[PDB]
């Protein structure tokens, strides 16, 4: 995360680190006690569940809980070159016992109100500058949703933002997801203070450039896929 702050322990109870061969690789979000929602890109080199561990806690150096992974599911139409359908599910070996500090985020309704300009939080252990090192403690950034149409301006992504994607950033630039944040959540809460995952960190042109907002998988576009793969509604 560029332009963010360190998150407090317990702030983001759904956030997990997905570790490949004992190093942080991707973020993800608990969507129930046995399933994590993340990005397909996370698994481009390794989709062996036995080589992945999910952790909870704000530190990837000293995690609070380590969780074995049973299966990794990638969207069947993930296309890496265009980033289309960048979404994946991780099934845990054991059901997590939920607490205040570890529990699930809600899935959005198909009609979830996600207006252009609306503020949202993005979280992860990614770099603070493009292609830089990961950070050991979870960071958070507050961004605004940027409509696909605006995101597709000629000086921005010029048509590369597709309907199952969404964009987010801030008016001045400098707040964004970055390398190592892939798979982590973009979240908004409703009037009852229930938090929903509206986006999954996916890609962007470098990080934090004002004309190049971060690009996310649009969760509403995949609700049927998630329900089919897991049974979960929402």
């Amino acid at each position: 995360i560029l332009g963010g702050t360190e998150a407090e322990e317990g702030s983001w109870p759904w956030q997990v680190s997905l570790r490949l061969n004992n190093a942080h690789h991707c973020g993800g979000s608990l969507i129930n006690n046995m399933w994590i929602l993340t990005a397909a890109h996370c698994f481009r080199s390794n989709s062996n569940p036995r080589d992945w561990i999910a952790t909870s806690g704000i530190s990837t150096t000293f995690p609070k809980l380590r969780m074995r992974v049973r299966n990794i599911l990638i969207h069947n139409n993930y296309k890496s070159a265009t980033h289309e359908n960048d979404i994946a599910l991780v099934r845990l070996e054991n059901s997590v016992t939920f607490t205040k500090d570890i529990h699930s985020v809600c899935l959005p309704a198909a009609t979830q109100n996600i207006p252009p300009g609306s503020t949202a939080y993005v979280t992860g252990w990614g770099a603070q500058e493009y292609a830089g090192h990961t950070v050991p403690e979870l960071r958070q950034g507050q961004v605004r949703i940027i409509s696909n149409d605006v995101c597709n301006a000629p000086h921005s992504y010029n048509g590369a933002i597709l309907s199952g994607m969404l964009c987010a950033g801030v008016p001045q630039g400098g707040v964004d997801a970055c390398q190592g944040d892939s798979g982590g959540p973009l979240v908004q809460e409703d009037s009852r203070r229930l938090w929903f995952i509206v986006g999954i960190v996916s890609w962007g042109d470098q990080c934090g450039l004002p004309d190049k907002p971060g690009v996310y998988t649009r969760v509403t576009a995949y609700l049927d896929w998630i329900r089919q793969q897991t049974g979960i509604e929402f």
């Binding site: 407090e8 702030s11 529990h103 985020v105 809600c106 939080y121 203070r193 938090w195």
Partner: peptide, 15 residues
């Protein structure tokens, strides 16, 4: 069952 989160708000109206 899902969605309990932090003492933070995403207000859209601040300038």
């Amino acid at each position: 069952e899902c969605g309990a989160g932090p003492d933070l708000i995403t207000d859209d109206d601040d300038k």
